[PDB]
Design an enzyme around this catalytic site. Sequence first.
Site, short mmCIF file in Angstrom:
data_model
loop_
_atom_site.label_atom_id
_atom_site.label_comp_id
_atom_site.label_asym_id
_atom_site.label_seq_id
_atom_site.Cartn_x
_atom_site.Cartn_y
_atom_site.Cartn_z
N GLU A 20 -0.14 -3.51 -8.02
CA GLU A 20 1.26 -3.44 -7.76
C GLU A 20 1.82 -4.37 -8.72
O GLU A 20 1.84 -5.82 -8.82
CB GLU A 20 1.54 -3.87 -6.43
CG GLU A 20 3.10 -3.93 -6.15
CD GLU A 20 3.97 -2.62 -6.06
OE1 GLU A 20 3.08 -1.70 -5.61
OE2 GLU A 20 5.11 -2.57 -6.44
N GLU B 8 9.88 -2.48 -14.80
CA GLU B 8 8.34 -2.35 -15.37
C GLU B 8 7.94 -1.24 -16.17
O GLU B 8 7.06 -1.54 -17.27
CB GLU B 8 7.39 -2.84 -14.41
CG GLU B 8 7.11 -4.39 -14.05
CD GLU B 8 8.60 -5.19 -13.50
OE1 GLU B 8 8.92 -4.62 -12.44
OE2 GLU B 8 8.97 -5.94 -14.42
N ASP C 41 7.16 -2.99 -2.39
CA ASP C 41 5.98 -3.52 -1.53
C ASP C 41 5.70 -2.71 -0.47
O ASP C 41 4.63 -2.03 -0.38
CB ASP C 41 5.81 -4.88 -1.49
CG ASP C 41 6.13 -5.57 -2.79
OD1 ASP C 41 5.47 -5.42 -3.74
OD2 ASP C 41 7.00 -6.55 -2.57
N1 LIG Z 1 19.63 0.23 -0.31
C1 LIG Z 1 18.42 0.64 -0.42
N2 LIG Z 1 18.06 1.94 0.39
C2 LIG Z 1 16.88 2.39 0.18
N3 LIG Z 1 16.12 1.96 -0.83
C3 LIG Z 1 16.37 0.99 -1.41
C4 LIG Z 1 17.47 0.15 -1.59
N4 LIG Z 1 17.83 -0.63 -2.34
C5 LIG Z 1 16.48 -0.61 -2.90
N5 LIG Z 1 15.73 0.40 -2.61
C6 LIG Z 1 14.40 0.76 -2.97
O1 LIG Z 1 13.77 -0.61 -2.93
C7 LIG Z 1 12.93 -1.32 -4.18
C8 LIG Z 1 13.38 -2.76 -4.27
O2 LIG Z 1 11.90 -3.44 -4.49
P1 LIG Z 1 11.26 -3.54 -5.95
O3 LIG Z 1 10.94 -2.13 -6.49
O4 LIG Z 1 10.19 -4.51 -5.82
O5 LIG Z 1 12.60 -3.95 -6.92
C9 LIG Z 1 13.68 -0.48 -5.27
O6 LIG Z 1 12.31 0.12 -5.95
C10 LIG Z 1 14.44 0.71 -4.63
O7 LIG Z 1 13.60 1.86 -4.84
#
Ligand SMILES: Nc1ncnc2c1ncn2[C@@H]1O[C@H](COP(=O)(O)O)[C@@H](O)[C@H]1O
Length: 448
Positions: A250, A280, A433
């Site tokens: 990850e 990324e 995650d």
């Molecule tokens: N309000 C939201 N509702 C549903 N999914 C979300 C929301 N905000 C972010 N996400 C998803 O959650 C992830 C956040 O974690 P990260 O990928 O580690 O930045 C993002 O990749 C988005 O795809």
Amino acid sequence: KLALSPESRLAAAWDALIAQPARRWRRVAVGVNACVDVVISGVKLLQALGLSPGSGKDHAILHSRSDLEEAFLYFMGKGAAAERFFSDKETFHDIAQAASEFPGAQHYVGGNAALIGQRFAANTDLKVLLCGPIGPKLHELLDDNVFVPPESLQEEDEFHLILEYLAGEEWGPFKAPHANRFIFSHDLSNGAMNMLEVFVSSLEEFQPDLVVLSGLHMMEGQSKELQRKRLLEVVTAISDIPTGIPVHLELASMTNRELMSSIVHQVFPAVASLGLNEQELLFLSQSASGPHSSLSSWDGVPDVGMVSDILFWILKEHGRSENRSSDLTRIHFHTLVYHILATVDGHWANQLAAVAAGARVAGTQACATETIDTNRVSLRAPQEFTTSHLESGSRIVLNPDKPVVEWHREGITFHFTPVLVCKDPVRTVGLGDAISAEGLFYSEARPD
Ligand SMILES: Nc1ncnc2c1ncn2[C@@H]1O[C@H](COP(=O)(O)O)[C@@H](O)[C@H]1O
């Protein structure tokens, strides 16, 4: 009946399509980054330390309560985000203790690996082993079903202090123009992957079906030689895990190209699966060769075709090939408004349900509901899109009743679904995650 919303239609089609794979994991091992996030009003904390308002002034490193106050005030005045290292170990212990004990402060499981472990541990028929810097508070916070080797238990936690301000908040002459957070820590454990050895050492006994690794990004800013030692430890450890046990990497928060390059060259061939977001992904394309490296940044929602060209390219450049003896056959891409699961044909099953399941958890966890609350979600993916712009791709139109879309390109298959985005989210730190853990839980590897 009246007509249902696109979102209710979509969540109903997911509920019918989602089901666990035929053959299920029994045991998953996860490491190695882990901490406790303490979310607290910054003004309240500083006041609680007995500090009167001083001056806003930036400091590259925080050596003292003064430095902390001064840099916090500086960023609070800008309404801007920052992160700092706090250098005095004992002083930091007393501040983190004060923040953690402050009434109304929120405590959260932190760290990609711990967050992954926590998501997997929600299912009782899956046994989770977690390594990382796990002190008594994090152990308490973790789900009881999570097994932490006694070797991986330590006296102190790694606290990350998240000091929030609201738009319009005031303290003496200071006033925040936007709501933001200032974060600090004294976290050498996660920075050095100090629990990598303990994690590697625990795998043989545990006999994982699935190994999940995260935390490499946290070595950003350490000695290049220390990084090189750790990446070799990773690759050696994985070559000692029995053949045919999938390893997922990850990926996260990377800004160093030397390190990214090294992870691609060394670690990518050693893992079955990769998980990452738009940031990324574009960063990868910018380092190496890149179908769209030229583009500095995504201009709003990332273009699906452009995304898919990069995922395609990764599995072609670095994915399993007859020449390559690379083990990489899977990439779980997740961005805000859609997720894609890309797989080298004939190595994985149940990838329709898996990508659907990753997308669904993004909705439910963001809203803090058990199931999708269709009043609080919103479909924000593009209504139509091309499956590649570089190559000549299909023109897809979104149908809420058939939300998971499949297409093929040279022995590689893509599985696309939009996200039901929580409009009023509680807290979405760590969502990638939980998305990757859900995607893997619902995935099935096949015999190597
Ligand atoms: N309000 C939201 N509702 C549903 N999914 C979300 C929301 N905000 C972010 N996400 C998803 O959650 C992830 C956040 O974690 P990260 O990928 O580690 O930045 C993002 O990749 C988005 O795809």
